[PDB]
Design a protein around this ligand. Structure first.
Ligand SMILES: [Cl-]
Ligand SMILES: [Cl-]
Ligand SMILES: [Cl-]
Ligand SMILES: [Cl-]
Ligand SMILES: [K+]
Length: 233
């Protein structure tokens, strides 16, 4: 097992937090399919560079940027309406990412506590997980993007602080390990005082991956013994 990089020596952890979108489920592929279908109509390419400019943006804000840079003729409100309508139809087809099932089973076997955090709210969470209820029931608890204790989204640490505090009994933040795909979540994890494993899209510039404790090509390359957890049998 090979890593792409390490920012700092791994410290032992007791509790794990997984971001859902992009890391556990292939939702980024679904966004790209849908935006690409729309852009096709205008002979425009929803490219990696364009995606990168709307990473971490709310839907209206992302829509306005796509419209500007691709010179699309619709309003941001119309693009949001169309894309969210199509995403509602494709979300339930979300697939678990490579290595996710293996790692969760391993954590359950060894009684390692783990939980789920996500920027998605209820409606999208329910659609995206609709065919994976058994897998999602394995997590200790789930914190959604609309959670009462989350005042601010990523890159603010709130989502991961709330997630750590919901464990009974709660650990020290420093004993928690976050799994993320996106730079906004890496920054949030670090600002929460936690270590972070990043599994970024292979197109993401390496300059945006430099802060994460550990960067991997796939969750399949995760070696739990680097953070003081039991190694795979
Ligand atoms: Cl692309
Ligand atoms: Cl939004
Ligand atoms: Cl949402
Ligand atoms: Cl916010
Ligand atoms: K994410």
């Amino acid at each position: 097992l090979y890593f792409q990089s390490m920012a700092a020596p791994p410290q032992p952890v007791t509790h794990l937090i997984f971001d859902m979108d992009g890391l556990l489920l292939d939702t980024e592929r679904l966004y790209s399919v849908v935006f690409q279908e729309i852009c096709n109509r205008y002979d425009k390419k929803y490219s990696w560079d364009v995606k990168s400019l709307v990473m971490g943006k709310k839907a209206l804000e992302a829509a306005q940027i796509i419209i500007d840079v691709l010179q699309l003729p619709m309003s941001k409100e119309e693009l949001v309406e169309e894309s969210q309508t199509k995403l509602k139809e494709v979300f339930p087809t979300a697939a678990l990412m490579p290595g996710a099932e293996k790692l969760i089973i391993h954590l359950r076997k060894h009684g390692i506590p783990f939980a789920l955090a996500t920027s998605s709210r209820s409606a999208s969470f329910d659609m995206k997980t609709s065919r994976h209820k058994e897998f999602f029931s394995l997590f200790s608890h789930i914190v959604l993007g609309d959670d009462p204790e989350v005042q601010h989204g990523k890159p603010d640490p709130d989502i991961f602080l709330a997630c750590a505090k919901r464990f009974s009994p709660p650990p020290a933040m420093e004993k928690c390990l976050v799994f993320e795909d996106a730079p906004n979540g890496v920054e949030a994890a670090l600002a929460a005082g936690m270590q972070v494993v990043m599994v970024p899209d292979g197109n993401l510039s390496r300059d945006l991956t430099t802060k994460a404790t550990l960067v991997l090509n796939s969750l399949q390359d995760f070696q739990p013994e680097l953070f003081g957890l039991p190694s795979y049998e």
